[PDB]
Each structure stands twice: as structure tokens, then as C-alpha cells.
Design a protein around this ligand. Structure first.
Ligand SMILES: O=P(O)(O)OC[C@H](O)CO
Ligand SMILES: O=P(O)(O)OC[C@H](O)CO
Length: 321
């Protein structure tokens, strides 16, 4: 039985968070573990809200490809079309930004709590360009912040507004929003772990400021339940937000990396992973969007990482075990 096997693996790995497994469009596992907030004696629930972290980049990527489908941008466009003040790397294409094949990097945003337009301005003013990284896979979050700025510039909407109408409203997500406004009901607290810690003790929480949340524009500012994250990623692969032809164009790997169009592309599906602020998020999904695994945790432990567990579940699920 799948329930028995997955529960055993999650308990032996000391999982804290919510787990969802879907096979051929049917939920076969949906269970929560540990505490959303230990001091308040609030257990994690299947509908608890967790940080999606870098998995948000897959959504920013779809937003760019929606603009391509609508004739409003092209993947061959150079970044300098939208950021004319850049002094270097001006030829970098939107394609490369989506694939993490650029030389742009920004290790920190402003220490102030800024509105979106000023977060974009700060990044454009302060980003650095490494020519030796151009054209080769290297993970750099600023690419997706700058892509969120392109969404804003082309549409005349905030990224938050665009995300809300294109994902939250479109797919009737009821456990999704922006951390900066509060999670609301069924919220979770992120816990800080020691490097070698495997057992949860809830002895320290992980802080995150409004500045840090604003600076995650396009890149890791959203909370979701496991169900809402599955819904978004499956809807993308099913053609509900973007033609399947354009999903395939977007989700194309490069010569130097599986990453392309905001996800890692494999022979048997896609994967995305997030880590930050005490959280870890993991999705593996089949090419048709009908079979996959979502694990989200508010208690990240390097010595008990959840991606390896999700990878094992996914591999077995795709075989038939
Ligand atoms: P993600 O990427 O989103 O998390 C942000 C970085 O990990 C900094 O903590
Ligand atoms: O995005 P990955 O693949 O580097 O995994 C860790 C994330 O960057 C953090 O959110």
C-alpha cells in the first residue's frame, strides 16, 4: 500500500510539514506531520500554508511566456529593451534569463522595505554582470526579479496584481497569497535548525523582515498549500494557462543544464526546489501534469532534506510502485 510506505518513509525521515501524492489525477496521499506553531500547539494540517520559495520562479516564467503568446514580448528580446540603463550584459535575452544562463547577479536588495517599482529600480541600478557566466547554467535569482519587472513594464500592472489575476483568481486558489500581507488562517511558522539536527525540537524560529519579503519579488514571496501548488504546476502542464506548444517551448533545457523556463526538465517530468527562511519546498511532476509529489516543510533540516524523499516517491510512482 502506498499510504503505508509513504507514511513510514516520512516518519523515518522526521518530516515536518504537509505531503501530497497524486497519481493519474487522483490524490493517493494527503497527510500532515508535526507543528505549524509549537508554542501555540497548532499542528500542521493538509491545508496549511507554506513558503513556495524558488518554485515561484516557474510561475514568473509562465507569466513571461503568456506575454509571448499574446504578442507583447519575444524570447529573443534583449534585456536592454526593458532596462535601458544597463551598462553591461545588454544583449542577454529573455530566454537566457528564464534558463539561468546569464551573467547577472545581485546578492542583496535594499535594507529598506520598498514598493515593487523601487525594488525593481534598486536591482537594475545595483546588479553586477559576469561575462564568464554568460551562456552557461548558473543559478541566479535576480534573473527572475528582473523578469517580474518586465511583466510590470509591459502590462502596466503590479506583479502582485498580475500574479493574482493570472494564478490565484484563474485557478480559484484559496490558500495562496503574498507573505507580506500575512498568511492568515492555517499559517505556519518557519523554524531554524542546526546543521546536524535531525529531530525537531522547535527551539528557535526563523525571522523574515518585510524588506526581505519585498525583495523576493518574482522569486520567493508567495505562500501556498500543497494542493494549490500542485494545482498551479499541473494546470501549466495541462495547457490551462498557456498553449501546450508554448509550455514545451518554455520548458526546454539548455546544453549546460536541465533548467529551462523556470523548472528543471527531466526525461520523466519536471522538478523544482525551494529553500529559505526555515522552509523547504519540493515538487516532482510528470510531463502530462497528472502524477506527482509535493512536499512542503516549515522545518528545513540539511540532515533531513525533503527533496531526496520526494525524488524516491516520484521515481516509484512513475514506475508503478
Ligand atoms: P529562495 O531563493 O526564494 O530563498 C531565498 C534565499 O534562499 C535567501 O534565503
Ligand atoms: O532553486 P534551487 O534549485 O537552487 O534550490 C534552492 C532554491 O534556490 C532556494 O529557494
Amino acid at each position: 500500500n502506498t499510504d503505508e510506505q509513504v507514511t513510514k518513509a516520512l516518519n523515518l525521515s522526521h518530516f515536518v510539514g504537509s505531503a501530497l501524492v497524486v497519481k493519474n489525477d487522483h490524490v493517493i496521499y494527503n497527510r500532515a506531520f508535526g507543528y505549524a506553531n509549537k508554542a501555540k500547539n497548532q499542528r500542521n494540517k493538509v491545508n496549511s500554508k507554506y513558503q513556495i520559495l524558488s518554485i515561484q520562479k516557474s510561475m514568473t516564467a509562465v507569466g513571461i511566456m503568456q506575454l509571448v503568446q499574446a504578442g507583447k514580448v519575444k524570447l529573443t528580446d534583449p534585456i536592454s529593451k526593458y532596462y535601458p540603463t544597463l551598462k553591461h550584459g545588454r544583449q542577454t535575452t529573455l530566454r537566457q534569463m528564464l534558463d539561468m544562463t546569464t551573467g547577472f547577479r545581485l546578492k542583496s536588495g535594499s535594507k529598506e522595505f520598498l514598493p515593487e517599482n523601487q525594488v525593481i529600480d534598486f536591482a537594475a541600478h545595483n546588479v553586477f554582470y559576469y561575462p564568464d557566466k554568460n551562456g552557461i547554467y548558473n543559478y541566479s535569482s535576480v534573473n527572475f526579479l528582473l523578469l517580474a519587472g518586465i511583466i510590470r513594464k509591459v502590462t502596466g500592472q503590479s506583479y502582485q496584481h498580475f500574479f493574482t489575476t493570472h494564478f490565484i483568481d484563474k485557478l480559484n486558489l484559496n490558500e495562496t497569497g503574498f507573505l507580506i500581507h500575512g498568511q492568515g488562517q492555517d499559517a505556519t511558522t518557519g523554524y531554524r535548525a542546526l546543521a546536524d539536527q535531525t529531530l525537531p525540537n522547535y527551539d528557535q524560529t526563523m525571522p523574515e523582515s518585510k524588506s526581505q519579503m519585498a525583495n523576493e519579488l518574482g522569486t520567493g514571496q508567495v505562500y501556498m498549500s500543497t494542493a494549490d501548488l500542485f494545482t498551479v504546476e499541473s494546470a501549466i502542464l495541462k495547457g490551462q494557462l498557456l498553449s501546450k506548444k508554448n509550455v514545451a517551448i518554455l520548458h526546454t533545457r539548455t546544453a549546460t543544464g536541465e533548467y529551462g523556463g523556470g523548472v528543471y526538465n527531466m526525461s520523466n517530468g519536471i522538478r523544482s526546489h525551494g529553500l529559505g527562511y526555515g522552509y523547504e519546498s519540493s515538487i516532482f511532476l510528470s510531463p502530462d501534469g497528472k502524477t506527482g509529489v509535493v512536499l512542503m516543510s516549515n522545518y528545513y533540516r540539511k540532515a533531513a532534506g525533503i527533496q531526496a524523499t520526494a525524488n524516491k516517491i516520484f521515481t516509484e510512482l512513475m514506475k508503478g510502485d
